[PDB]
Design a protein around this ligand. Structure first.
Ligand SMILES: [Mg+2]
Ligand SMILES: [Mg+2]
Ligand SMILES: [Mg+2]
Ligand SMILES: [Mg+2]
Ligand SMILES: [Mg+2]
Ligand SMILES: [Mg+2]
Ligand SMILES: [Mg+2]
Ligand SMILES: [Mg+2]
Ligand SMILES: [Mg+2]
Ligand SMILES: [Mg+2]
Ligand SMILES: [Mg+2]
Ligand SMILES: [Mg+2]
Ligand SMILES: [Mg+2]
Ligand SMILES: [Mg+2]
Ligand SMILES: [Mg+2]
Ligand SMILES: [Mg+2]
Ligand SMILES: [Mg+2]
Ligand SMILES: [Mg+2]
Ligand SMILES: [Mg+2]
Lengths: 71, 208, 103, 219, 109, 129, 84, 33, 87
RNA sequence: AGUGUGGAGAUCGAAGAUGAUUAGAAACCAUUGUAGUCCACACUGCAAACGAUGACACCCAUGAAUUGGGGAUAUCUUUUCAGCACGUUUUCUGUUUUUUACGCGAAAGCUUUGAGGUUACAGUCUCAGGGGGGAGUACG
RNA sequence: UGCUGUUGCUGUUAAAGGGUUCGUAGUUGAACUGUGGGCUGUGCAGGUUUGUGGUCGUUG
């Protein structure tokens, strides 16, 4: 249930503002914690130097050696 | 339904129907009451027996008779009685009015299971007791069959369209009510004369 | 998935808040008095065979003066009521039926 | 060969009942699918198998697999029928669903959006149909809108004969068994809504079984 | 156990209905009668049918039997009006309020 | 605490129409309630109604022909310009062919079709169809 | 029976059973009685639901004793219900 | 068995483990403080 | 009665019956809605050829209120008399 | 439950001990047993603190009941808290409910005691939620 | 995406009514001051006035 009064705009604005943070996609889009944790820093691509070739095993029930590199 | 277009008084109680109703104790109501049947109850006497309003009882009986008399093919109205005491009454009623009858257990699916032999489609269903004929009433609701019932003071009136307030217990009462209905249906048809008393005796309607 | 409308006790939602617990007759488990299964027991002091002998040897007791009987209000926890066959599990439709007099 | 089993069936075969509207007028149940076949003109009744999926019942040795089939029957001119029936084999389910769909045919009322020129193209008013958690809301639309609906309701509405409608489906619409029935239930409500055009008193008429009772008796 | 199966019981009922006059309480004459009016590859069944047929014959002598038709052997109100009805106080009160008035042959008990 | 007398009255009528009652008692009464009832009565959705005086907020007994599918109040009374009639008809009415939105205009309480013809806006009171 | 109720015009039977505030138009259940003192026969107007120590001027004899509802007149007292 | 899955150890004892862990971290920070 | 084209066609498939008690439209799928025909009676006790027919919706016959509804209708039609005459 | 200070300590009893039972048994069972349990004052304010159902207000079908107060009119007791008390029938307001109508709901189920009167979505206010965890954790 | 819901979500059991009260800001908040009147033409509904198959005493 919710408020319905004619002059109850401030309550509805505050209520929606407080509850938008419950949305993970909205919170990520409006907080820098994910941006700082993102290695690309918000970029679509990034350039790097290959350090080592590694073999990452596939998770069960798959069984393979996924060829990956450390960059 | 005593009232008619002409304004006549032919279809009214004649102080003789009242004597027959009173003699057979057709106005005693199981000492129990139902909200649906509260309108038909005149009052409660000592020992707590509800007294059925005779004016309303006669008016509903006339209405039911006029409904039955409008069926051109009398085989299209089925009379049912799961109770033992109504078996001869509905048998005698059918042999006089021309209706189809069915006593004893009502087979589930008689009105709704088409592919079976013994599947019948009556246009009007009349039952002796709504409580014990609940299966016939329940099936009639699925196939557009209106229901006439001999309801007591404690009677489930769910799918009942025409409720006749009477004592649907006891041998004498059930026989008398069907005798009155058969006589009135014949009178409305014109097969007998209202001026002369009906020759058929209620004893033939009595169970055993 | 509410099993019972009354939640297995005689305490509607706006009657009381707490019913003082009682010890089970057999094990001593503390259960609310309304929830515990309570049977009033009128047990004969002696069985028929032995009462015959005692009444034979008693000037006090006989065909005219009956022997005393034990009267106990027994309240069981649910586990002890079930294990002692005082009550059993029932079909879902039969769970609703209730008794008011000792039959 | 068809040997009629009900009084309505005999009346239809004897051509005493010539239109499906007469059956709908008196709310007579249809228990023989040959009634719809004879009353609907040949080549005018179309059917489609909307959905076939298997249903399984666990047993002491493995599990028993049956198939539920949904069939839609419509003339694209205001008559729609939906049938679901489970069979041991797919072919049995499909044939039974076609029979069931014919037995459940209902009339759907068509209305106008604004100007009432030409034949009706949309539903007369906003109606919702609910089955399970799936609810389908049909909203009248102007001409040229088309059926703005999911493919399953759009197929049903095409068979019902509507041209323009706005739809919105809530609930778990991927449950197509409930989605099909919700659309069907929304279409039935069109003729149950009392509009001001239907306020006027209508003269009562006799049902065909009462009208031709003597003919039925001589059988 | 010696429970008669439905095939035995149904045939026994049919025999009794069709050939009631030819049957009596003796198994051996009934068995002879049944062997003439029955085609069955099993003599054990015909013996069992004869046993249950004579059992039904005994029951029929002791009143009716369900499942057997045998369709060869299958006004007090005026007296009460004369003696009076003697209605209750409230019932009499209802009659006094009627258009026809209080009917004759009634009392207040 | 009852906050809207009109909403209470329209809720009571809608419940009675759903149950198929022949008459319904409305309590309390008001000028706005009577004006709303007269609008519905004008278009034929209700029959005769009687106002009973009790030297307080009175009572109304409304006779009901079964023509009223649903009536309800809109709270709060949103402002409605003459250009907003089509928006409200779309949102709350079952169709563009029948049903009425009731407005409080400076010219009085009237249905949306009448208000549109008079070129006047106002506040939405409720609806019926 | 056969007489469907009218909300505007209730039957005296149903309306008489209504609570005083549940009637179509609410009204009092009380009334006034002119009471004759059992000592002087002086007429005193006493409220039916009186709760405060009614005394007859003169003898100063308690005419009624308050109760949960209607007052209880003293024994051997002559009262008649006044109109309106 | 009046309850559904705890899904990864009884939550009461997990809360107890977290509580003891909180106390240990508290004492460590107190030592450093 | 029913929807009408601008030109004047009736457009509607059919005009459903309305319950004589609650005026609700009687749909084609309820299967509990009934039609009851009451024979008209002339000045003599015999019945005429005409009848009076009333339609009752299925839901009213489910609530148990069809008997009350028929009583009210029959009284309004002048077929049934509310009270017995004066003695 | 826990904490502080006084008192109390009959009963029962976390910790602990011992005897059993066990492959092991730091448990269940037996005998004990400290803190506690009880009281006063002061803290604590974390419960399945549940009707797992926020508050106020309106409509709402049926039958038996039940608690308290009032209206009206078969039975029992009736030498003083007594012109009594109970009890019968009917009614009424207020309370805790029960059995079996719409309607609602994913269903279990709810139903004048709503979870009904909601896509035909608007009586008023307010609190909370937005896949599972990490985590009611880290930091302040 | 009616999964941010003013339109337009959910909160018995799925995530979610605060343990209970009180309570400022804030939101919301019961009725009433009020039918205009005749006149005319024009199309509708029912309080009574002469006349013209039913019940009812015996023309009523
Ligand atoms: Mg309380
Ligand atoms: Mg508690
Ligand atoms: Mg219990
Ligand atoms: Mg378990
Ligand atoms: Mg469980
Ligand atoms: Mg869970
Ligand atoms: Mg403590
Ligand atoms: Mg302490
Ligand atoms: Mg010290
Ligand atoms: Mg000890
Ligand atoms: Mg908490
Ligand atoms: Mg909670
Ligand atoms: Mg109390
Ligand atoms: Mg209830
Ligand atoms: Mg959600
Ligand atoms: Mg939860
Ligand atoms: Mg709470
Ligand atoms: Mg203010
Ligand atoms: Mg105001």
């Amino acid at each position: 249930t919710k408020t319905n009064g004619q002059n109850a705009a401030r309550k509805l604005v505050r209520l929606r503002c407080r509850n938008r943070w419950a949305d993970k996609g909205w919170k990520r889009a409006h907080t820098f914690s994910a941006r700082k944790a993102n290695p690309f820093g918000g970029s679509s691509h990034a350039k790097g130097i290959v350090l080592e070739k590694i073999g990452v095993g596939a998770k069960q029930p798959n069984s393979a050696i996924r060829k990956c590199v450390r960059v | 339904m005593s009232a008619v277009e002409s304004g006549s008084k032919v279809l009214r109680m004649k102080e003789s129907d009242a004597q027959k109703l009173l003699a057979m104790r057709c106005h005693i109501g199981t000492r129990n009451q139902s909200s649906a049947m509260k309108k038909y109850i005149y009052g409660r006497t000592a020992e707590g027996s509800h007294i059925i309003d005779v004016h309303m009882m006669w008016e509903k009986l006339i209405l039911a008779a006029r409904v039955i008399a409008a069926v051109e093919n009398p085989k299209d109205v089925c009379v049912c009685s799961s109770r033992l005491y109504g078996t001869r009454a509905i048998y005698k009623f059918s042999q006089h009015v021309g209706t189809s009858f069915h006593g004893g257990r009502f087979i589930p699916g008689t009105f709704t299971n088409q592919i079976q032999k013994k599947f019948v489609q009556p246009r009007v269903l009349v039952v002796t007791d709504p409580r014990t004929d609940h299966q016939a009433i329940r099936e009639a609701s699925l196939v557009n069959i209106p229901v006439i019932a001999l309801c007591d003071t404690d009677a489930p009136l769910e799918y009942v369209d025409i409720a006749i307030p009477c004592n649907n217990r006891g041998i004498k009462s059930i026989g008398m009510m069907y005798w009155l209905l058969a006589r009135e249906v014949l009178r409305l048809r014109g097969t007998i004369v209202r001026s002369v008393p009906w020759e058929e005796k209620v004893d033939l309607f009595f169970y055993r | 998935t509410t099993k019972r409308r009354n939640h297995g006790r005689s305490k509607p939602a706006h009657s009381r808040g707490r019913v003082k617990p009682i010890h089970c007759f057999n094990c001593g488990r503390l259960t609310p008095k309304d929830k515990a299964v309570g049977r009033f027991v009128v047990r004969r002091m002696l069985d028929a065979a032995s009462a015959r002998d005692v009444a034979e040897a008693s000037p006090v007791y006989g065909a005219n003066f009956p022997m005393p009987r034990l009267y106990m209000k027994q309240r069981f926890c649910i586990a002890c009521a079930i294990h002692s066959r005082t009550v059993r599990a029932r079909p879902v439709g039969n769970r609703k039926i209730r008794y008011t007099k000792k039959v | 060969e068809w040997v009629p089993c009900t009084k309505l069936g005999r009346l239809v075969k004897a051509q005493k009942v010539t239109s499906l509207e007469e059956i709908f007028l008196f709310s007579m149940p249809i228990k023989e699918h040959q009634i719809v076949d004879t009353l609907i003109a040949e080549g005018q009744l179309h059917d489609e198998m909307m959905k076939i999926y298997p249903v399984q019942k666990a047993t002491s040795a493995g599990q028993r697999t049956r198939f539920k089939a949904f069939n839609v029957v419509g003339d694209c001119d205001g008559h729609i029928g939906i049938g679901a029936r489970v069979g041991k084999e797919v072919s049995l389910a499909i044939r039974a669903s076609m029979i069931a769909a014919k037995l459940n045919i209902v009339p759907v009322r068509r209305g106008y959006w604004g100007n009432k020129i030409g034949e009706p193209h949309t539903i007369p008013m906003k109606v919702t149909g609910k089955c399970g958690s799936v609810a389908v809301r049909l909203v009248p639309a102007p001409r040229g809108t088309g059926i703005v609906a999911a493919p399953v309701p759009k197929k049903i509405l095409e068979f019902a004969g509507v041209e323009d409608v706005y739809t919105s489906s809530r609930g778990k619409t991927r449950t197509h068994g409930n989605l099909i029935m919700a659309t069907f239930y929304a279409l039935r409500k069109t003729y149950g809504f009392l509009t001001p055009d239907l306020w006027a008193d209508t003269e009562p008429s006799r049902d065909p079984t009462d009208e031709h009772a003597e003919l039925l008796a001589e059988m | 156990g010696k429970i008669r199966t439905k095939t035995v019981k149904r045939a026994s009922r049919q025999v009794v209905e069709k050939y009631y006059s030819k049957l009596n309480f003796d198994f051996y004459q009934n068995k002879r009668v049944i062997m003439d009016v029955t085609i069955a590859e099993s003599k054990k069944l015909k013996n069992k049918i004869a046993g249950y047929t004579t059992h039904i014959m005994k029951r029929l002598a002791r009143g009716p039997v369900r499942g057997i038709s045998l369709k060869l052997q299958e006004s007090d109100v005026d007296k009460v009006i004369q003696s009076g009805v003697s209605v209750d106080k409230k019932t009499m009160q209802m009659l006094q309020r009627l258009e026809i008035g209080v009917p004759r042959r009634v009392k207040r008990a | 605490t009852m906050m809207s007398v009109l909403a209470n009255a329209l809720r009571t009528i809608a419940s009675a129409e759903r149950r198929g009652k022949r008459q319904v008692l409305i309590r309390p009464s008001s000028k706005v309630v009577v004006k709303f009832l007269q609008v519905m009565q004008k278009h034929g959705y209700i029959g005769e109604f009687e106002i009973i005086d009790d030297h307080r907020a009175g009572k109304i007994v409304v006779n009901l022909n079964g023509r009223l599918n649903k009536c309800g109040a809109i709270c709060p009374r949103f402002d409605c310009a003459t250009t907003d009639y089509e928006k409200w008809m779309k949102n709350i009415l079952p169709s563009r062919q029948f049903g009425f939105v009731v407005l409080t205009t400076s010219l009085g309480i009237m249905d949306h079709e009448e208000a549109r013809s008079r070129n006047t806006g106002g506040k939405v009171l409720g609806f019926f169809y | 029976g056969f007489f469907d109720a009218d909300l505007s015009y209730p039957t005296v039977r149903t309306e008489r059973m209504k609570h005083k505030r549940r009637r179509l138009v609410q009204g009092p259940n009380s009334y006034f009685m002119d009471v004759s003192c059992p000592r002087c026969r002086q007429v005193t107007v006493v409220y039916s639901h009186a709760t405060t120590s009614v005394e007859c001027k003169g003898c100063s004899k308690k005419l009624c004793r308050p109760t949960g509802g209607k007052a209880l007149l003293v024994e051997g007292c002559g009262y008649r219900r006044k109109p309106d | 068995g009046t309850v559904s899955r705890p899904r990864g150890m009884r939550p009461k004892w997990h809360k107890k483990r977290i509580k003891r862990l909180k106390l240990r971290r508290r004492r460590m920070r107190q030592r450093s403080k | 009665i029913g929807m009408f084209n601008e030109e004047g066609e009736n457009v509607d498939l059919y005009i459903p019956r309305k319950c004589h008690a609650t005026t609700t439209l009687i749909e084609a799928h309820d299967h509990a809605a009934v039609q009851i025909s009451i024979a008209n009676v002339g000045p003599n006790g015999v019945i005429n050829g005409t009848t009076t027919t009333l339609c009752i919706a299925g839901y009213l016959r489910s609530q148990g209120e069809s008997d009350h509804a028929i009583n009210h209708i029959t009284i309004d039609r002048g077929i049934m008399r509310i009270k017995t005459g004066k003695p």
